Write a protein that binds this ligand. Structure first.
Ligand SMILES: OC[C@H]1O[C@@](CO)(OC[C@H]2O[C@@](CO)(OC[C@H]3O[C@@](CO)(OC[C@H]4O[C@](O)(CO)[C@@H](O)[C@@H]4O)[C@@H](O)[C@@H]3O)[C@@H](O)[C@@H]2O)[C@@H](O)[C@@H]1O
Ligand SMILES: OC[C@H]1O[C@@](CO)(OC[C@H]2O[C@@](CO)(OC[C@H]3O[C@@](CO)(OC[C@H]4O[C@](O)(CO)[C@@H](O)[C@@H]4O)[C@@H](O)[C@@H]3O)[C@@H](O)[C@@H]2O)[C@@H](O)[C@@H]1O
Ligand SMILES: [Mg+2]
Ligand SMILES: [Mg+2]
Lengths: 924, 924
């Protein structure tokens, strides 16, 4: 039963959601909803990014979740997802407008479990899983690194023995004169102090482990003709594949409802309290592991952490970084409550008053230990940073609803007044100069150095007056009209309030009397909708010209702190310097709501007595007056960025969902749920400065207007040179040589320059599809979910560090294994450019070489279960006893054009492991 | 129904508790429990101090509250007290031992409301009250202040015109030569700059107001044969009589229980969430208001805050202090949850597993605004202090219980394992040098001065193995035996665990067959108990020799920060000085549990068919091996304090409770509940250093061993001198003169010195009593509660500032009105010493003059209510509709020997106002 019945609403089967055994319920439905993309890195937490109906605005695109009627935007990884009874995604503006003023990016409606009338249920779910690291990037070992360095040296024509890295090469020339390597030897110690012995270290294996996931849920549900209740407890723990990274969560939910008199005075509440403790991986840990050469030992001769010495590249020890980061644990208390009262003066009138609260409290204590890894050190700096953050949101809602059933005319009239009110704050203390260097001793009182205090606060409010009218004739013609008047504190008084209408029409064709002979066609419905929604998800301080006293106490990398503190006297400090103010942004009093107009046309069908069901949707979204933060013109200086309504986005999309469930003669019940979706995104208008800086695409070379959001312009790589004749015949370019990348001459001017660039990257897949298969046979249930993406291109940064030598900022870094298969006179059958120590050709430029085909098809979740026969369970007094074994991310298929691995995560983000899970469910 | 039936247990009628309409339920039963003293200052919060059975130890004496089986020690002012169904105070060690290892100071058992089986109830309570400031200290006005100063000047023989305060006196001599004042005049401006005009300011009226108290509670309760639930919402707000001080609290409680199978698997939970926001009064605000003379105007000529100028005494403006303190608001989130599961393998066996959690989160932001009140200033210092505190306690409990009913023998055997685990932390950031000077702008990021970071953490754990055996023969002979094995993390491994036994006997004399002819004697029971309990409420870091790197970043008054930072180079600072460590305390590995042995004998009676009931109890408490923090010997230096088991306290007490309820011929139902209690406290052993410093009594002159806790030694004032002959005849003393205090010569050596001191102060009342009267007549219910204390002495500090002139640290301060009635040749009929500007006689010394009789009898609460007749309520569908008007602290009677006012609060603490409340209860 859809909550709108006349809009683009997707109902997710919650039973299949819990099968995947994911902490985040949103991550579970990664590819089960058409036109809704979920991207998850693979960290122990269930944090993921959601994009509904593509990219719809130049602002925050997270959809508005609704739990028990209370809206929010925080991720669901911090809430217990095992007590959800229904999930509905409202991807249509007309249908989702009535649920809030933040519905521009879509609304996901989540309903929690409630006690079923007249019965009691208890469910205990246990789950133990092992997560294994699968996407192991192949990097050069010691011998391979030496061979690659020798190849680069001989290709450049330099002496390979001058590497000054302890490698001594015995080599010569063949009959054709091409250099050949006979053998290599290494010095025992990398430094003259004999403190860093040479070793063959697998850094990826050193920093990875086999994670353990535990999940225990216990829920009890109570129903009656007269009231109901529900109490759930949950514990989740996930150890990541990366060492010293973990995430655990305790959860307790209590829901209840009471009916007084006979039917009047229905008072209900839903509350949940969660406590999540997490240690996250340091930024660029995978990059650090990939960059550091395998010759560096984990431990030095004296037992301290190993590190680069002499001429080895400056990279920290990833194991040491993980060890020092294991104490950066943060605790997060989440609190989602709601209490509502419903009054019924007579049969058709309802008055609902609702109060919802969301309180979040985050406490963290970060430590900075002194480290000395060879030549890598922080000058013995030890510090503590105690940070506290508070978020407090509350919403009050009043709803008046009237229903009439006059003849064949059904009429629902609803009005509503809503207030939303959010306040955020944070403050932190910073201390230095510690002695014991242990988390027990590192407290700000125990410090003996410079101290810093940081602190800020913000907030906003929203007011909404909405109305909804639904008319039904003969249960065949449906009309819906909703109107919203929304105001926010982020806008000035003149442009505070805005009006948004939406209309929906629906015709149940099967109800018409002219096709009663079509017995096979069980149900057919055609619906259309045209709606407008408002977007105001911008910075709270958007219309003010901000001047802030930035003294410079905040840590900055590179010294570009832009602080306001100058030693005007010239005494080299020694006290409190005079300070001032700096401009952060220029105010704009003409900012108003961004208007997103959505037109949707859908056809729902069901054939063969509800056996073959499905839906087909086509949508057109047009966002105008987009509140974008334009940067300064360049001579406007600091604080030149300002918010302006100068945007325009278009999204044209198709979605198709199908489902076929049927039994078999010998007792097999098969259910197939297929889904496919495609969309095209375009930017029609954009501010000149925004298009110039290329923050939304174009790389600052060409304007992204008229092209897909995020599209990138680069050169075109027409293979590599294989002879001097090819270099001479090709158009002249700097650094052209044998074995170097050849770049196409777009304008045919005879010279390769910055004007020889074109659109090369389009981050829009041709189509994304999913398929769920459920088989039941003799108490055996098998679930198999496949997700595929076709026609998507990806920019690969790992390729830049695997197909080239000395293509990074610093040289002598560790590279990929496939680098060994580079072009050479001895090995002409290769497309990888020849190794070189100098990037004369400038191959780090954006080009089609780094663009790879990201199409993939992976088995997201497979599960085989066994249900104990009812007689044995009744003997053991359990109403339902089930066991199951599942595999998540077990298998994947990728295109041959993708040189790397894991097309879903082709970069240095958190890896996605393979989960092998065993679980049991008891229904006492 | 008592939960022990064989110990000293007092059951408090919760219905009478809610009548007083107090936020703190503990404050409501201030004098309704024998042998239990409640002291409340009168602040908007319900915070109060509880002492059960007198002072029982030299450590923290707060009793252990128990809510829904979870123990705690936090005050109940931060929890909703309107959803309590039963309150039981266990004042006996034997009865309260089984409830925890922290039962040395008594256990208060609080049970929350739960849904009554087979029915639904909703109650809505509204209450609006006005609090009026009654204890207005009478201080001298401008003319009275001038007259008093002139009298002091003429008594001292000096020229009254040299006061240099703008007072010009026209005066002369009478026939007898005694000075007489004819008139006085004042300069218009107190300073030569004409910025502080003279005025007659009533500072007490200026800083006080009429407070408004609002209370709104809404509870719903759900019962069934098969499960139950309860949901309560509450809002409280109290504006104190002192301006810019307030306290509000939101509360939400959800309780539920579910029964599975038939009777096995009973799963229940009780959760409550509270949010209290409070602004407290600054320290010594009443003292500041009393000290500042009335001549100082509230506002200056330019509109700024008025302040002392010229020779006026240095005192801040209390109104300015309150105005600057109005932004020091702290928010406190309290979280008390519990979840339990009960299993019944068969009829007599029960297994209960309980998990309780208490999470408290306090966030505060204090501001230091620059002030310039005449000559009072802070050199334009502006600062912000953002403080965060976290408390997290959790308890796990396992209980196995077996019951047997063999013939007339009833046997209960219970064993239990309990773990308690508490962790506390706090951290704060400090910033300076602000410009706008508003709470919106004062954030640590906006500061431009020196920053400080403070932070600390601590915690402890408790393990308990307890057993309880109850045997009943013929329902006439009762025996109870409990044994506890308790260990704490605050002790070393050798002395970690301790064993505590307790035994209880009971005989129902009325059940014997030899007195069946005594029909009037309905019930009679005689019980005895001997128990031992353990006390370990000490500092967590008690056995460790503490060395801390106190750099000195903490603010200190007077400069005695004892910081560790020295400019060893001699450059007047300019950087980070070298630091070190200092000793905080000396460890003691021999510390163990403090053993409190309690012997109780009680007689319970009920006569005339449960019409005249009552109880009489006698108790003897002996605490030995008391963990006391002895100070250093004096040459041991800093950190010489250490914890040692060298204490011994004795408490001998009597309690008597009586109750008589009966109807009348014409339809009047009268119920009287009287209570009386008395106790004597003594200290038998004490460390030599502790007795020398006199922290527990004696004022450092004589050892408190063998005397009451808190007893004070001082001189004896034998009136005042009235002639030179009296001075000559009396023993010689320094400063002796006409009109000065005469001090008794205790040792008869002819000279008054420091050896002429004796025990003068004993802080133990002769007896404390209470009386509750409840009258019902024709839908009119009248409640009247009186509380009286007799035989208590109080040290008065207000008297020192009201009966003497220039008796404070600084001169020319404002004094009390009764100072005008001082002894003089013109007014010989007075006992107040003559005014003087020099304290030559040293009348500030501790003496019997400042000891006053604190006996009082006050009407704590009176309430008149009207209940709507049942027919009208049934017409309006309400099951019960009631209105009421009440007065709290309306009337009091004090002894004539008490010169001041409000004997309950005879000092500069928060005043106790008179509350006039109107409330309604609806039982829809
Ligand atoms: O991130 C910018 C923006 O986020 C806000 C608004 O909620 O708060 C986020 C703060 O969290 C910070 C570090 O403290 O990073 C986010 C990490 O903290 C976690 C903890 O669960 O997330 C917290 C917060 O972000 C979501 O996860 C986003 O959906 C929400 O579910 C949740 O409420 C964790 O998920 C992240 O790793 C940092 O970004 C912010 O201080 C604002 O404070 C801030 O403006
Ligand atoms: O007071 C010393 C001792 O108290 C602890 C242990 O709980 O925490 C008290 C902290 O609160 C401080 C200021 O932050 O003063 C107490 C004021 O805060 C309130 C807020 O409700 O009380 C908090 C805390 O103290 C009780 O009230 C005592 O019964 C408890 O009910 C409640 O848990 C308020 O009542 C007081 O005005 C300060 O004393 C402490 O930082 C320890 O932290 C500390 O060692
Ligand atoms: Mg060209
Ligand atoms: Mg003497």
């Amino acid at each position: 039963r859809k909550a709108d019945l006349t809009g683009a609403v997707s109902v997710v089967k919650v039973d299949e959601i819990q099968k995947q055994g994911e902490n985040n319920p949103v991550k579970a439905l990664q590819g089960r909803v058409p036109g809704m993309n979920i991207t998850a890195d693979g960290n122990p937490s269930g944090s993921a990014t959601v994009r509904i109906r593509g990219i719809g605005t130049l602002n925050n695109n997270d959809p508005l979740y609704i739990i028990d009627g209370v809206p929010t935007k925080a991720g669901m990884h911090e809430l217990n997802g095992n007590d959800i009874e229904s999930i509905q995604v409202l991807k249509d503006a007309a249908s989702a407008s009535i649920y809030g003023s933040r519905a521009a990016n879509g609304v996901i409606i989540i309903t929690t479990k409630q006690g079923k009338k007249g019965q009691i249920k208890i469910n205990f779910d246990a789950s133990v899983s092992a997560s294994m690291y699968q996407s192991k990037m192949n990097v050069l070992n010691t011998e391979q690194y030496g061979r690659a360095m020798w190849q680069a040296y001989v290709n450049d024509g330099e002496n390979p023995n001058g590497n000054a890295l302890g490698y001594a090469y015995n080599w010569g020339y063949n009959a054709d004169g091409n250099p050949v390597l006979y053998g290599m030897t290494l010095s025992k110690y990398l430094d003259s102090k004999n403190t860093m012995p040479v070793a063959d270290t697998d850094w990826f294996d050193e920093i990875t482990r086999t994670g353990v996931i535990q999940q225990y849920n216990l829920s009890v549900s109570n129903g009656s003709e007269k009231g109901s209740s529900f109490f759930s407890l949950g514990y989740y723990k996930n150890l990541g594949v990366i060492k010293d990274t973990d995430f655990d969560r305790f959860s307790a939910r209590m829901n209840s409802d009471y009916k007084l008199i006979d039917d009047i005075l229905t008072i209900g509440q839903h509350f949940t309290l969660n406590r999540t403790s997490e240690v996250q991986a340091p930024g660029g840990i995978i990059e650090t592991a990939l960059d550091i050469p395998s010759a560096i030992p984990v431990y030095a001769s004296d037992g301290s952490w190993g590190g680069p010495v002499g001429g080895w590249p400056d990279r920290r020890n990833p194991r040491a970084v993980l060890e020092y980061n294991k104490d950066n644990r943060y605790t997060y208390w989440r609190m989602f409550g709601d209490a509502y009262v419903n009054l019924t003066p007579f049969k058709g009138f309802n008055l609902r008053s609702t109060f919802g609260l969301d309180y979040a409290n985050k406490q963290a204590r970060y430590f900075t230990y002194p480290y000395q890894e060879g030549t890598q050190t922080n000058n013995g700096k030890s510090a503590v940073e105690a940070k506290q953050e508070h978020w407090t949101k509350w919403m009050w809602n009043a709803i008046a609803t009237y229903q009439l059933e006059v003849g064949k005319h059904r009429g629902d009239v609803m009005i509503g007044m809503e207030l939303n009110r959010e306040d955020d704050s944070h403050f932190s203390g910073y201390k230095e100069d510690f002695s014991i260097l242990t988390p027990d001793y590192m407290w700000p009182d125990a410090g003996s150095g410079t101290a810093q205090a940081y602190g800020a606060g913000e907030g906003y409010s929203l007011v909404s007056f909405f109305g909804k009218m639904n008319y039904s004739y003969a249960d065949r013609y449906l009309l819906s009209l909703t109107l919203r008047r929304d105001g926010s504190s982020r806008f000035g008084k003149n442009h505070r309030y805005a009006t948004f209408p939406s209309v929906s029409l629906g015709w149940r064709i099967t109800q018409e009397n002219f096709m009663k002979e079509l017995t096979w066609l069980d149900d057919l419905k055609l619906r259309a909708s045209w709606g407008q929604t408002g977007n105001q998800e911008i910075s709270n301080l958007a219309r003010y010209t901000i001047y802030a006293p930035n003294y410079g106490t905040t840590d900055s990398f590179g010294g570009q702190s832009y602080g306001t503190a100058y030693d005007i006297t010239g005494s080299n400090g020694g006290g409190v310097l005079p300070s001032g103010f700096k401009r952060n942004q220029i105010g704009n009093d003409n900012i108003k709501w961004e208007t997103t107009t959505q037109t949707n046309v859908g056809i729902d069908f069901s054939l063969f007595k509800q056996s073959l069901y499905g839906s087909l949707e086509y949508y057109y979204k047009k966002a105008t007056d987009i509140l974008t933060e334009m940067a300064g013109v360049g001579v406007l200086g600091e604080g030149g960025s300002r918010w302006i309504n100068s945007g325009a986005m278009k999204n044209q999309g198709f979605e198709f969902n199908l489902g076929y469930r049927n039994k078999t003669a010998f007792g097999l019940t098969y259910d197939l749920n297929g889904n496919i979706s495609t969309y095209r995104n375009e930017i029609l208008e954009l501010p000149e400065t925004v298009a110039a800086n290329g923050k939304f695409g174009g790389n600052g070379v060409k304007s992204v207007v008229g092209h897909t959001y995020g599209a990138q312009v680069g050169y075109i790589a027409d293979g590599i040179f294989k002879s001097q004749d090819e270099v001479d015949n090709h158009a002249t370019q700097e650094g052209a040589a044998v074995g170097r990348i050849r770049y196409r001459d777009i304008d045919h001017n005879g010279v390769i320059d910055e004007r020889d660039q074109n659109w090369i990257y389009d981050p829009t897949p041709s189509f994304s599809y999913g398929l769920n298969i459920y088989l039941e046979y003799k108490n055996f249930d098998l679930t198999m979910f496949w997700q595929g993406v076709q026609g998507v291109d990806i920019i690969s940064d790992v390729k830049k560090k695997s197909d080239f030598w000395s293509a990074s900022n610093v040289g002598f870094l560790n590279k990929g294994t496939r680098l060994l298969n580079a072009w050479s006179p001895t090995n002409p059958n290769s497309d990888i450019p020849a190794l070189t120590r100098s990037d004369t050709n400038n191959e780090q430029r954006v080009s089609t070489y780094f663009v790879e085909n990201g199409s993939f098809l992976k088995l997201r979740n497979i599960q085989l279960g066994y249900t104990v026969p009812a007689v044995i369970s009744k003997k053991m007094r359990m109403d339902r006893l089930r066991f199951y074994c599942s595999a998540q991310n077990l298998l994947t298929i990728k295109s041959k054009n993708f040189t790397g691995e894991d097309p879903e995560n082709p970069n240095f983000s958190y890896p996605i492991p393979v989960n092998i899970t065993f679980g049991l469910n008891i229904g006492f």
